[PDB]
Structure formats: structure tokens, C-alpha cells
Design a protein around this ligand. Structure first.
Ligand SMILES: *[C@@H]1O[C@H](CO)[C@@H](O[C@@H]2O[C@H](CO)[C@@H](O)[C@H](O)[C@H]2NC(C)=O)[C@H](O)[C@H]1NC(C)=O
Ligand SMILES: *[C@@H]1O[C@H](CO)[C@@H](O)[C@H](O)[C@H]1NC(C)=O
Ligand SMILES: *[C@@H]1O[C@H](CO)[C@@H](O)[C@H](O)[C@H]1NC(C)=O
Ligand SMILES: *[C@@H]1O[C@H](CO)[C@@H](O)[C@H](O)[C@H]1NC(C)=O
Ligand SMILES: *[C@@H]1O[C@H](CO)[C@@H](O)[C@H](O)[C@H]1NC(C)=O
Lengths: 191, 119, 360, 109
């Protein structure tokens, strides 16, 4: 079929790394039952511009998850905040890749946040993140009563019905043959 | 009553820089924005920027960005305009104006005499 | 001649409030004791989106000079409160959430924002619950919680408040859920009182199991916070008649009243700011571009008295005098007023607890 | 920005009947029920003077002969009767978008 996975990265070569990782993920599990896709954008200086760009570029493609990295220049440490807010409005899981701050571990403020790095090599974490998502996606669609994610963020005011179900599937996962051991998540989305 | 007064005329062999003052003697000088305008020989008006003396914040126009610097002196109640790198297109009259903070619009009420710079 | 404030009010469409009354709201107060003048710009919404909210706010900021913002909607989410906090932090505007999803309290706000809400905190809810328990001589109780966030601080506050009286409390146990490991936990409770802490979707199941085992009837008092009794007239099929819960006053506090209170608070804060330093801060030029270090309104609203009543806040964004009320689920299967919280002492209307029987 | 336009550039009217001036903008200037448009009078050699604000409210301290009306993107100002006052230029200014812009002016005789 078609499934779109979204990412927000730093440079243009990380885009090709993400594309090749997804193209491998389609070669690994198989085909003719589920496919994957790569939608990605760069960062924005202004936070409001970043949130608008997310709402008008990634959600409009009906993404199932969003990966967020850190910009090369640490001008501000709280870069994934706009993405986290605008994606937790609809309960779309967001997988942080590099940010290590204890604030994001609070699940009452941020609702759909996971990170492959406890808060006290980006190219490696990209390869490990696509494996965990694409494994749970193939797990998830085997069951029934699964509805498509929202498209656009203008005429839609409700949440994703199966969004909470995805997080529980996503959390209760073990990824074998990891580049840094089996990626397992605790009760708060940390490692 | 609110009153504004400016300096006299200016004249300089091309290549100099000019400074103009505007004094307020009727209110609390640090509460209302001050605006600067340019008028060419009778074909319109423009807008350069504004300064709030109380906080020191300044905003500019992109056409006049990097050419005019607006500074304030909260002790002498004077607003200062610093034009640099004069050319043949800088012969114009300038006004310092201040609104009245009681409306929703952004209009100009109190006007100075104006000073004619010539190159 | 002092200056005037420009305040933008955004309200939900489904509140039965006309747009003319918003800009004629000064008439009922006749400017009251407001130190400053206010020009009001009224905008109406029905349901908010993360992009619609941003577009509306930036369009409002572009048109004129904005000194404040009072926000109140009919959508029930916490993402709206988070978005308001983000916008306030990014644009340096004071924002007040008075009704709907904005009024929902959120902890650990960003220290560079100026977002304040009309709501009571979980600590204050626990305080009023303990007050009612002590008033009805229920000195022995038990605590049943779940993994839902906030249980740690709830338990800590309960203990700390328990240990310090002339009463002499008799707390029994603290049961936590992480029928083969929780069967033990549900087999060790005898105290009539049982303070529960979870969401509705888990409370229904826990309460059903307790009923089916024999924890319901004449003398079994279940008390739950405002999280378990949220949207009224959505009572599930299994809630025993005789529940006790706390909730913010939505029966006598009106939108027209709280908008006026917010206007008074903002006016007093701005007047205090102008008195100290001779300028009132405003928002920046536009959203789209590329830090007000002198002073902010974050310190002049530590104490604010308006029209007699003390409308002051705390250091963390909480009110000092929230309007909390006490409710019960009577035989006709709807929540009913049973007591009121005001000043620092509740006032019950029965003074001897009637007997509520459950499940016929 | 918003670009204004005034017609006619030069106007010649007899003394007594009236005078009409129009100023049409490129984009709408309405802001939640309050149109933003100002009219000015500028005698030669003197700074201008505010006449009308918000396109419909006259300014206290001015003769009642001045009046203006309009909405949307087309605005107008009419003075009546004609006296020795209408010998200066007139402008229109918008405050909907930063930066503010003025018109081109219009003389009378
Ligand atoms: C960091 O990431 C880079 C790029 O993914 C890694 O380079 C490759 O890592 C894989 C996995 O072990 C090896 O099979 C390849 O042979 C490596 N590339 C080359 C050219 O040898 C790198 O090993 C990772 N570790 C570091 C250096 O942080
Ligand atoms: C995959 O690519 C596009 C762009 O990412 C995506 O919107 C769509 O789901 C897929 N299109 C195709 C060609 O299958
Ligand atoms: C949403 O609310 C606005 C009020 O600002 C209204 O104009 C619009 O028609 C509403 N949309 C729907 C679908 O009812
Ligand atoms: C309340 O605020 C006013 C503001 O001037 C201050 O004078 C007064 O002392 C404050 N009250 C207390 C009890 O601190
Ligand atoms: C409660 O009322 C008393 C009686 O005047 C007053 O002294 C006290 O400040 C009030 N406290 C609160 C929290 O309302």
C-alpha cells in the first residue's frame, strides 16, 4: 500500500540517508502488503515558521510518525518544542533523536514524545529509528479496525482515533540486531 | 500643553553627516513613541522609523535601513536622528511627530516645524 | 493624560454571547474603578487548530498595538493551553485563559512566558477533600492510585498534610497499580473512605470490580478529584449514587463576569507597571522576522485587588481564591451541589451526611 | 505594503458649492469593524494637520464643513461649502500595515 513517515533533519545528506534507510526497510520485511515512503524537510530559524511549515507540509501528507533531530548550531536547545506541540494536538507519535532534556520526559505536557537517547552520531540513530517504526507498522496493520491518519490541519479539529493504540504498540517493542543493542523503551518513552 | 521644537537649516559640501534634535516640553517623554518622516519637494511623504524613550526599542524601514540611526536622550528630552553618507537624493524636510495613546488607529497629531537639509 | 490599553478578546461561538456586548462590556461596569482606559477588539471562533490559532494571533498583532489577550473557548483539550503558552513565550503578550480548554491547569510553564489561568490545582483539590473528610469525622481512610501522572505528588501532599493536626488522622494504606498481582491489593481494603486517583476510563473498571466484590453500599464513601468527574451529563452506567467530587464553579460564575474580572486584573497590572517605570510594554512588530529584558508584567500581579475581592495570583500561575464547589451524584443520576468552598473554610448544607444507596 | 492613489491630481472648483476627493487603496484596510484611513490638510510651508481619522470621525477643533465617508477599498472626502480654507493640499494615509504610506496629494483652486 502506502505509508508516509516524516522527518525533520539538519542537512541535505541526512535526507538521502533517510531515503536509503526507508528503501532498505522495504527490502527487508518484504512487499505487496505494506510499503513505506519518505517525506522530509529542513529546519527553520523562526519557531512560528517551523510550526506552520510542519502543519502545512508533513501533516498534509498523512504521516504516521515524525522524527526530529537537532540543528548543527545549538542556538536554542528547545528546538523540537513546536513539532511536539503541533503533533501532540492530534496524538501523532514523535520520536526524538538527539535532545536530552528532562522536560520532555513529562508526559502530561508532551503527549506523543519518544526519544532513542536517555536525558542524563546522528547517522546511527536514523538507522535505528526507522527499524523500530517500520517493525511496529508491519505489526500494527495485521490487526483490524485501523483508520487512516488526518490529512491537513485546517478542516480537522478532532484527534487520531487509533493514535493512542499506535503508541502502546510502539512502546511494547524490541528491535533485534541493533547498532547499539536492542532498542527498548521504558514506561516514559526513554531508554 | 505638548510642544515640539527642532533645529535650524543645514548645509554641507557633499559627503558629511547630519544630526537633528526634537524637544518635548509638555508630557512624560518616556511613554509615547516618536516618529520621523521625510518629505521631498512636494510629491509625497515617507516613514523612516520610531523610538520609544522609556524602553529604548527601535524599529526601522527597510528602504532606510542602515542609513538613519534613531537615538534618544531621556535626560534632555531630545530625540536624535543620525543620517550618514549623504547623496544628491537626501535634500528633504523632516518632521518629528507623536500620536496620542487613546485610540485604536495609528495617526499623527503633534508636528514640529521641520528642518531643510541641502547637499 | 494617561494612555489607554488595547485588549483583544477571543471567545467561542457556542457560548450565547453576542459580539456587540463584548465591545459594550464597559457599560455594565461604567469603567468601574479601572485605572486605565481599554479599547476592546472582539473576535469569535468556533473550534481552534494549531495553524488557525497562530494565523489569528499574528493577524491581530499586525493591525494595531496589542497590550493583552483574554482567551476562552469551548474545545476541551490541554493542547490549546500548551499552544497559548508557546505563543505567549514567543510574542511577549500577557494571556489569560478563563474558560474551556485554556482554563485547564498545566504545571511547569516556561519561565519566559506570561500565561495565567483560571483554575484550581490538584493540591488545592486535595486540601478541600481533606477538609470535608475532617468535617464529617472520617479520620480513617485509604489511598488507591494508578500510573496516571501526578500520583506521586498527590500522595506526598496527602502525607504531609496528614501529619500535622489536633485531630489525629488514622491513614491505613497506599495501594498502587503498576487479577494475579492486583487481586492482593484489592483484598486488603476495609476503611469506608477510599480516595481514588485515575482517569475516567480506568475509574469505570476499578469501580465496577470493587462493586462486584463488595466495596459498595451503605457505608463506603468514594471521593474522586475533578479529573474523574469532568464533563457533566456524561455519567457512565456504573457510578454509585453517593460519590463526592470537587469541580470549578460553572453554575454561578458567568462568562460576562470572568471577562470583566480579567479586564480588571490586566488594567491593574498595567497601572502598577506604569507607576513604577514610565512605560507600558507591548507586543513586537510581527510574527515573521529574524527580549524585553528591562521589566515585564510577571512581577506586578503578585497581589492585585480589584472591586474589593482579591484577584491576586501566586508565583506559579495559580489563583489564591479559586471558586471550587462540592458535588454529589444523587438518585436522579446527575451531579448536584452539596457544598461550597470560599475564603479558607467550606460551607456544607446538610451538616449530617444523608444516606445514599447505590444500584437499587 | 498598501499603495494608495488619489484622483484628480489637480482640481479647480468654484467657491461655494463643494469639493470632492477620492482615494482608492490596493488592498482592504478594514480591521475588525474599524476602517483605518486618515485625511490631512497641509498649508504651504507648514506641517500637515489631521482632519479625519478612522475614515468617519471628524477631529475636535476643526470646522464642521469637513466630512468623510467610505469603506472597503474605496474612500472619499467631501467639503462643503467652499471657502478660503480649501487652498491647501490633501492626503490620505493608511495604518493597517507597517510601514504606513501616504497618498500623492491634490491641490485646489
Ligand atoms: C557513526 O555513523 C557512521 C555512519 O553510519 C558509521 O559508519 C559506518 O558504520 C557501520 C556500522 O558499524 C559500518 O558497517 C561502516 O563500515 C561504517 N562506515 C565506514 C566507512 O566504515 C560509524 O561507524 C558510526 N560510529 C561512529 C564513528 O560514531
Ligand atoms: C510517496 O511519495 C509521495 C511524496 O512523499 C507521497 O506523498 C505518496 O504517499 C507516495 N507517492 C507515490 C508515488 O507512491
Ligand atoms: C468556525 O468558527 C468561525 C467563527 O470565527 C465561523 O466563521 C466558521 O463558519 C466556523 N466554521 C464552521 C465549520 O462552523
Ligand atoms: C499589594 O500591592 C500594592 C501595590 O502597590 C502594595 O502597595 C501592597 O503593599 C500590596 N499588599 C501586600 C500585603 O503586600
Ligand atoms: C478569609 O476571611 C478573613 C476574614 O476577614 C480574612 O482575614 C482572610 O484574609 C480571608 N482569607 C482568604 C484566603 O480569603
Amino acid at each position: 500500500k502506502i505509508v508516509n513517515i516524516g522527518a525533520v533533519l539538519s542537512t541535505r545528506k541526512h535526507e538521502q540517508m533517510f531515503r536509503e534507510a526507508v528503501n532498505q526497510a522495504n527490502k527487508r520485511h518484504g512487499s505487496w502488503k505494506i510499503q513505506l515512503n519518505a517525506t522530509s524537510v529542513t529546519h527553520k530559524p523562526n519557531a512560528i515558521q517551523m510550526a506552520l511549515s510542519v502543519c502545512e507540509d508533513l501533516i498534509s501528507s498523512q504521516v504516521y510518525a515524525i522524527l526530529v533531530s537537532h540543528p548543527p548550531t545549538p542556538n536554542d536547545h528547545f528546538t523540537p518544542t513546536p513539532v511536539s506541540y503541533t503533533a501532540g494536538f492530534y496524538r501523532i507519535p514523535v520520536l526524538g533523536l538527539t535532545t536530552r532534556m528532562s522536560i520532555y520526559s513529562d508526559k502530561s505536557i508532551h503527549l506523543s514524545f519518544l526519544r532513542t537517547v536517555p536525558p542524563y552520531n546522528e547517522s546511527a540513530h536514523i538507522s535505528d529509528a526507522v527499524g523500530v517504526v517500520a517493525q511496529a507498522v508491519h505489526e500494527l496493520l495485521e490487526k483490524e479496525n485501523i483508520t487512516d491518519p488526518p490529512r491537513g490541519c485546517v478542516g480537522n479539529t478532532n484527534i487520531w482515533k487509533t493514535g493512542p493504540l499506535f503508541k502502546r504498540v510502539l512502546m511494547s517493542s524490541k528491535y533485534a540486531d541493533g547498532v547499539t543493542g536492542r532498542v527498548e523503551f521504558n514506561e516514559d518513552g526513554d531508554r | 500643553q505638548v510642544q515640539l521644537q527642532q533645529s535650524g537649516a543645514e548645509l554641507m559640501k557633499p559627503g558629511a553627516s547630519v544630526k537633528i534634535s526634537c524637544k518635548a516640553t509638555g508630557y512624560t517623554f518616556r511613554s509615547y513613541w516618536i516618529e520621523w518622516l521625510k518629505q521631498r519637494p512636494g510629491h509625497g511623504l515617507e516613514w523612516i522609523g520610531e523610538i520609544l524613550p522609556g524602553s529604548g526599542r527601535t524599529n526601522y524601514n527597510e528602504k532606510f535601513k542602515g542609513k538613519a540611526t534613531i537615538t534618544a536622550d531621556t535626560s534632555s528630552n531630545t530625540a536624535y536622528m543620525q543620517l550618514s553618507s549623504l547623496t544628491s537624493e537626501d535634500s528633504a524636510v523632516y518632521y518629528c511627530t507623536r500620536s496620542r495613546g487613546t485610540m485604536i488607529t495609528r495617526e499623527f497629531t503633534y508636528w514640529g516645524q521641520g528642518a531643510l537639509v541641502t547637499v | 493624560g494617561p494612555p489607554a490599553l488595547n485588549i483583544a478578546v477571543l471567545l467561542g461561538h457556542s457560548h450565547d454571547v453576542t459580539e456587540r456586548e463584548l465591545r459594550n462590556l464597559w457599560g455594565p461596569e461604567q469603567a468601574t474603578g479601572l485605572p486605565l482606559d481599554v479599547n476592546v477588539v472582539a473576535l469569535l471562533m468556533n473550534r481552534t487548530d494549531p495553524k488557525s490559532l497562530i494565523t489569528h494571533v499574528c493577524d491581530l498583532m499586525s493591525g494595531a498595538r496589542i497590550h493583552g489577550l483574554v482567551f476562552g473557548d469551548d474545545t476541551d483539550q490541554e493542547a490549546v493551553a500548551q499552544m497559548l503558552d508557546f505563543i505567549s513565550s514567543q510574542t511577549f503578550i500577557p494571556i489569560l485563559g478563563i474558560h474551556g480548554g485554556a482554563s485547564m491547569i498545566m504545571a511547569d510553564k516556561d519561565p519566559t512566558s506570561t500565561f495565567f489561568q483560571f483554575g484550581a490545582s490538584i493540591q488545592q483539590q486535595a486540601t478541600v477533600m481533606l477538609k470535608i473528610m475532617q468535617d464529617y469525622d472520617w479520620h480513617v481512610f485509604s489511598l488507591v492510585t494508578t500510573i496516571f501522572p501526578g500520583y506521586r505528588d498527590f500522595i506526598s501532599f496527602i502525607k504531609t498534610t496528614v501529619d500535622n493536626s489536633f485531630v489525629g488522622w488514622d491513614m491505613q494504606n497506599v495501594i498502587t497499580l503498576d487479577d494475579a498481582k492486583t487481586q492482593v491489593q484489592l483484598k486488603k481494603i476495609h476503611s469506608s473512605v477510599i480516595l481514588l486517583y485515575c482517569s475516567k476510563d480506568e475509574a469505570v473498571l476499578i469501580l465496577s470490580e470493587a462493586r462486584s466484590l463488595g466495596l459498595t453500599g451503605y457505608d463506603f464513601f468514594w471521593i474522586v478529584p475533578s479529573l474523574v468527574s469532568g464533563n457533566t451529563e456524561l455519567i457512565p452506567k456504573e457510578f454509585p449514587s453517593g460519590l463526592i467530587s470537587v469541580s470549578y464553579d460553572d453554575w454561578d460564575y458567568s462568562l460576562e463576569a470572568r471577562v470583566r474580572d480579567g479586564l480588571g486584573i490586566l488594567t491593574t497590572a498595567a497601572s502598577s507597571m506604569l507607576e513604577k517605570f514610565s512605560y507600558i510594554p507591548e507586543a513586537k512588530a510581527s510574527c515573521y522576522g529574524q527580549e524585553t529584558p528591562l521589566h515585564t508584567l510577571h512581577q506586578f500581579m503578585v497581589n492585585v485587588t480589584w472591586d474589593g475581592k482579591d484577584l491576586s495570583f501566586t508565583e506559579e500561575g495559580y489563583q489564591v481564591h479559586p471558586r471550587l464547589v462540592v458535588i454529589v451524584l444523587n438518585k436522579d443520576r446527575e451531579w448536584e451541589k452539596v457544598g461550597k468552598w470560599e475564603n479558607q473554610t467550606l460551607s456544607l448544607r446538610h451538616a449530617v451526611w444523608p444516606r445514599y444507596k447505590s444500584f437499587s | 505594503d498598501i499603495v494608495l492613489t488619489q484622483s484628480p491630481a489637480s482640481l479647480a472648483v468654484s467657491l461655494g458649492q463643494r469639493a470632492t476627493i477620492s482615494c482608492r487603496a490596493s488592498e482592504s484596510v478594514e480591521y475588525y469593524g474599524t476602517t483605518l484611513m486618515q485625511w490631512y490638510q497641509q498649508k504651504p510651508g507648514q506641517p500637515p494637520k489631521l482632519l479625519i481619522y478612522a475614515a468617519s470621525n471628524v477631529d475636535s477643533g476643526v470646522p464642521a464643513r469637513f466630512s468623510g465617508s467610505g469603506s472597503g477599498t474605496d474612500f472619499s472626502l467631501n467639503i462643503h461649502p467652499v471657502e478660503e480654507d480649501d487652498i491647501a493640499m490633501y492626503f490620505c494615509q493608511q495604518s493597517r500595515k507597517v510601514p504606513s504610506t501616504f497618498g500623492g496629494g491634490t491641490k485646489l483652486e
